[PDB]
Amino acid sequence: TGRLMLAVGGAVLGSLQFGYNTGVINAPQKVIEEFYNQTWVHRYGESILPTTLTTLWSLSVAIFSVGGMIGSFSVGLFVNRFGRRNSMLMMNLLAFVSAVLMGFSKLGKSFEMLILGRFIIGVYCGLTTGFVPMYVGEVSPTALRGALGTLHQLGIVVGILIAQVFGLDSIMGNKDLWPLLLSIIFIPALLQCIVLPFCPESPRFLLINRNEENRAKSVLKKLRGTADVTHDLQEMKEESRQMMREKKVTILELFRSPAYRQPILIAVVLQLSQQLSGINAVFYYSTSIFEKAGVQQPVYATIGSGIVNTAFTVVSLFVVERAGRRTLHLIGLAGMAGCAILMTIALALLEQLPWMSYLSIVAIFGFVAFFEVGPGPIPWFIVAELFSQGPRPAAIAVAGFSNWTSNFIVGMCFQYVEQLCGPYVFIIFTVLLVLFFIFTYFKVPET
């Protein structure tokens, strides 16, 4: 419990860095867009086209999700081959590579570097979100396993907040220091590169994946702190039974078996309902949507959304263990729909009532607050509770693919939709939120 605080906190750095890379490109949108325009002129002696500037900066934020897909797929590769700890350590290379790329992108007069860096760091984020939850789950005692695993969640939302803070004009969200805003991630990396080597390899890797039972003994005693461990050791060997009991099934075997075709449908749709709700429409373009509203100091409203977001995350902890998954997920979609509607009213009546800009802030706060209690965590609780230890692994990969894919559809196309639909964009979210509300009220069983 003492030395334990090192290995965990050392791993959560990746989840901080995960959330940081997610929301850094929110506030400094205009300045980087100005840099694209600046770079476009220097090359061709011509101001960039507005539609091109759209899909270009959209690609710069969207390509990140593409990396995450690949990353989340490759987690199984490095984990069982190089170990949990060492996997997290070596993959800090992607951060330094990406940090340098996104940092010297301005000094290199190239948005390709920035896009490329955004891809690479996306892979790291996809890999990391597979490492951290798995590492702490094996390192922590079973008692604190259902509590320390929270730090991954908190890490992301807090990382998103810090990204939005630094996104201020006062700090790093400006003409001169935006390349550093993207690069500062090297600090967390450098820290994790120092800490992890002192942290212990997971015993479940030493006991199972290496059969080095003896090398695992020295871990738990220093790790768990307890002198003896002739019960935690037997535990893992008894929990590995259930994990090795029924045969694990592959991805494409999940599609072909009509026994698995119904629960998988629920899983994927529940992931679509998380992204196509359009919470990344705000976590990527909060400061942008606020600008089209009459919001004074919009970057602060984004930080507001971060704090509200971070807040209701902690609230959700003391709710999932108090209510049902079917209910909480329904509550979310409704509130997200209501707020999406309420958002449209603000964006519509602003031109008539020069103050509804304040309503848009409250709407989006509720739009993300209702998300973090319903469609936030639940879509990952239902999937893990619709499949036994055999097909459950393959189900996460599909769900993971479903999430990244639908995440890319929003972040890449939301601006193209924002131009044509005008103040009537959140209706798309409202509409889909209804379909997702119908789909769950009938076809989603409580667990």
Site residues for ligand 5RH per CB under 6 A: 72, 129, 133, 153, 156, 274, 279-280, 376-377, 380, 400, 403-404, 407
403 a known binding residue? yes
Closest distance between ligand 5RH and the C-beta of residue 194, in Å? 24
Give least dist CB 280 to ligand 5RH, A: 6
CA-to-CA dists, residue 298 to 182, 262, 360, 371, angstroms:
20, 44, 11, 21
Count Cα atoms within 13 angstroms, Cβ side, for 369.
15
Minimum distance of ligand 5RH from residue 155's CB (angstroms): 9
- Give 342's contacts (C-beta < 8 A, 6+ positions apart): 359, 362, 363, 366
Shortest Å distance, C-beta 37 to ligand 5RH? 29
- Nearest distance from C-beta of residue 345 to ligand 5RH, angstroms: 25
Angle of the 261-275 helix axis to the 392-420 helix axis, nearest 10? 40
Tell me the one-letter amino acid at 20. Answer: Y
129 marked ligand binding residue: yes
> Please, is 446 exposed, middle or buried when counting C-beta atoms within 10 Å of its C-beta (0-12, 13-18, 19+)?
exposed
* Rounded-to-integer distance, Cα 402 and Cα 119, Å: 18
What does the alpha-carbon distance between residue 108 and residue 197 come to, in Å, rounded to a whole number? 34
Q: Give 40 or 370: the residue with its C-beta nearer to ligand 5RH.
A: 370
Q: How far apart are CA 293 and CA 126, in angstroms?
A: 33
Which residue, 380 or 439, is less far from ligand 5RH as judged by CB? 380
Q: What is the CA radius of gyration of the chain?
A: 22
CA-CA distance, 199 to 193, in Å (whole number)? 11
Nearer to ligand 5RH, 6 or 384 (CB): 384
Q: What are the counts of helices (DSSP H) followed by strands (DSSP E) for the chain?
A: 23, 0
Residue (280 or 415) nearer to ligand 5RH, CB: 280
178 has binding-site annotation? no
Q: In the complex, what is the shortest distance from the CB of residue 62 to ligand 5RH, in angstroms, rounded to a whole number?
A: 13
Nearer Cβ to ligand 5RH (36/408): 408
Cβ-closest residue to ligand 5RH? 400
Q: Report the residue number, 105 or 280, with the smaller CB distance to ligand 5RH.
A: 280
Is residue 415 a contact partner of residue 249, using CB atoms and an 8 Å limit?
no
Q: Tell whether residue 404 is among the known ligand binding residues.
A: no
Known binding-site positions for cytochalasin B = 129, 274, 380, 403
Known binding-site positions for D-glucose = 274-275, 280, 309, 372
